[PDB]
Amino acid sequence: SQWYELQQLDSKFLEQVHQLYDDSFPMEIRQYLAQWLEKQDWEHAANDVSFATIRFHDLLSQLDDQYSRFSLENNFLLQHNIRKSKRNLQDNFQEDPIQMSMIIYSCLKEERKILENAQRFNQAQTVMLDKQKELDSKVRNVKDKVMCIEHEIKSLEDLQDEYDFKCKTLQNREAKSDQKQEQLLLKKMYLMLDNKRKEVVHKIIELLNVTELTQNALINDELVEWKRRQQSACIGGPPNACLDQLQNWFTIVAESLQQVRQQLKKLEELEQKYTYEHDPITKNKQVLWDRTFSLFQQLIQSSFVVERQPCMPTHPQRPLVLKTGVQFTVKLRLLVKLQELNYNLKVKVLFDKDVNERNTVKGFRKFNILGTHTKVMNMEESTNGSLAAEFRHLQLKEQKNIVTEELHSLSFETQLCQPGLVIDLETTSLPVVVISNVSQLPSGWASILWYNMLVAEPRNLSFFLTPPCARWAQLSEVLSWQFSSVTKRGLNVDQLNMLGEKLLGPNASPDGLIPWTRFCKKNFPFWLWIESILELIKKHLLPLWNDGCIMGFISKERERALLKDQQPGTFLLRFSESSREGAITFTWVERSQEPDFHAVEPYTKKELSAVTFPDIIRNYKVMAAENIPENPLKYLYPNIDKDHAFGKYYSR
């Protein structure tokens, strides 16, 4: 069916499919009666009441058949849903089937566009793809090699045992002198052990060499990259890759090391049983045992990371910003994962531990954690499980009696206790910002935005003393992101450009450079400004904004640019640059016996809370040159009819 065909597209189209189904015509129906629907001549019914009415009841009857199909399967849910869908459909169109037909028609019709527009497979006729592939190889290698060694150690151990047994046998029985020259039958046996031992030692070394080398990539590339993405991701960037891939690489090399350790033990047990001047096991004994633990210790300390940065469940929109007295959560996790580690790692949270500013910086506020300070890392069934501790129940508290842009950090300590084995693990979250009142979130978020967009390290906490600058090519992206995360759409080239200039003047360059002072520093700043627009958009213009029926960012300069020489009615929707509250306004052109340009005093939520913007756009009215009221709003930008465009949004 056309329905099926759609569910077979890239998540970018099926996402638009989503935005075609609301409670008016429940998608539940569009799917459970897709073959019936796709069949009917909706275009016709959209024009003839009787056909429409006939089909409306047919549609209802088709629902009844579907209800009974579910009754058989006892699918209590769908029975209930179908039931509701029918009841809805019913009292929404049983008096106007012509419109329900028009709905189904355009809905199916708009689906095709998407399948037609989804054939961009023409524009489809290795970066990380290859990288990821190599690591799997080295890692796999390390693995295999360990097993190979473990296999010769066993062959090594056996020979020695026979060998021993054979010697003992001779020197334990009842011209014999010349026959005692059989000592060579031993001399031979020895040259074997020596050679086999030297061999094992070689491989164990080679193995270490490799391992370390492969461990460098894993910890110095993969780990670092993932950490950086986690940052952007927390800042509104693309979804961060889960750990599973790392968690696997780490966990594998880890097992290998752990085994080499066992191998080293096995080797000494063979030394006890037998040694000699220049025995390799004895010579390498130490170096090896040490190289191994060295690698293994580094490995497992690198694996202890913050999987979910500090976040307040109440303001999930702003991760790294913590409000005093409000509860928050963080989640730690060890990328290694060995059963021999379950419940053996008690993790403790420390706020601002090892911080200079606690003394260095003057006034530097100081807070104290209040909830549960310690948690033990458990396993939790993912598709691969994972070894991690999570902290719900954390509260920050002010211990009292630059401005609020001071950074603090959360510390996580734990330790591995085993036989004559003890490793201390510690790691910290990205810098945090503590605030007292909600009003600071925007500002606070600004800091986090700056910090994470520029720094790569997890600690400095003094970043805002010499705030770097930002390459517009970079600030611009981060900004789009701020939108493409509160709404279904980000900022575009045109919108970005206006913003570019309002920061870099006219000579806007991808390599421009914006000081942090020209971002969150006679009326309020940029970020605070951009922020309050997102506020407005969110609580008063989402659909209009999402559907792209808002230009939002044009300079009054480029404003007329497009508005000059254009359909008299034509108007434009933009956000005010003036208001320190966030407001939109419109501008349009008129002919008055060149073009005349007009714009309304920006509308703020103060208004929009009383009358919908679309409604305002609808009933607006001004004095025409003929001293007779009428509203100049005729065409949206590319010549769309006022009603044509904002039609669905109209209150009534």
Partner: peptide, 5 residues
């Protein structure tokens, strides 16, 4: 801003 609400 030349025109009123």
């Amino acid at each position: 801003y030349d025109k009123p609400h």
